[PDB]
Paper text:
6-Hydroxymethyl-7,8-dihydropterin pyrophosphokinase ([name], EC 2.7.6.3) catalyses pyrophosphoryl transfer from ATP (cofactor) to the substrate, 6-hydroxymethyl-7,8-dihydropterin (HMDP). [name] is a small (158 residues, ∼18 kDa), generally monomeric protein and has been studied using various biophysical techniques, including x-ray crystallography and NMR spectroscopy. Three loop regions, loops L1–3, play an important role in substrate recognition and are critical for assembling the active centre. While loop L3 undergoes the largest and most dramatic conformational change during the catalytic cycle, all three loops help to seal the substrate and cofactor binding sites for the chemical transfer of a pyrophosphate from ATP to HMDP.
The x-ray crystal structure of SaHPPK in complex with the inhibitor, 8-mercaptoguanine was solved at high resolution. SaHPPK has a ferredoxin-like fold (αβα), with a central core of six β strands surrounded by four helices, typical of other monofunctional [name] structures. The two monomers in the asymmetric unit are almost identical, with an RMSD of 0.34 Å over all 158 pairs of backbone Cα atoms. The catalytic loops L1, L2 and L3 (residues 12–14, 47–51, 82–94) have higher than average temperature factors, showing that they are likely mobile in solution, which parallels the observed broadening of residues in solution by NMR. Like HMDP, the pyrimidine ring of 8-mercaptoguanine is stacked between the conserved aromatic residues, Phe54 and Phe123. Notably, two of the interactions formed between HMDP and [name] are absent in the case of 8-mercaptoguanine.
Residue numbers in the entry: -1 to 158
Write the structure that this text describes.
Amino acid sequence: SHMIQAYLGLGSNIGDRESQLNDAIKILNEYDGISVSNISPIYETAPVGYTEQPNFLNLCVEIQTTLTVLQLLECCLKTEECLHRIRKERWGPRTLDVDILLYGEEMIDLPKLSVPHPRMNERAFVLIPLNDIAANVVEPRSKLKVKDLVFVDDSVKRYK
Ligand SMILES: Nc1nc2[nH]c(S)nc2c(=O)[nH]1
């Protein structure tokens, strides 16, 4: 029953984006082994990867968890599946991504999962809201605290 502090990155660009983020946090906190303990501000962020698609809202969440990293990944996938479900066929699918950004101070390298997220230091839509709740946490690949990894990116703006 060793409690680990972990940080998750959440994002949605289709549908009621703020509602997708809020629901994901609520679902995650409903698992017995996960307690949501802090939430970053939401940021609106230009899309990374394909450029012709809507802007994302992104945030990060701090959790206190007794789950293993792979148990945590299970809860994340179960939460994505759930919030992807269509409401009305004609309104289209909904999106939500939930990624594990940090799990304690551990480095994990498995075929099914790398934590810290391996290219997360490339992504302002991760590091800017991460810095609001995890400024002093050391990211173990780089050995930098989040506050020192974070960089200026004008494509990421506070949403509210
Ligand atoms: N800004 C931004 N771009 C993204 N591309 C994918 S895929 N996922 C995301 C995301 O969550 N945010």
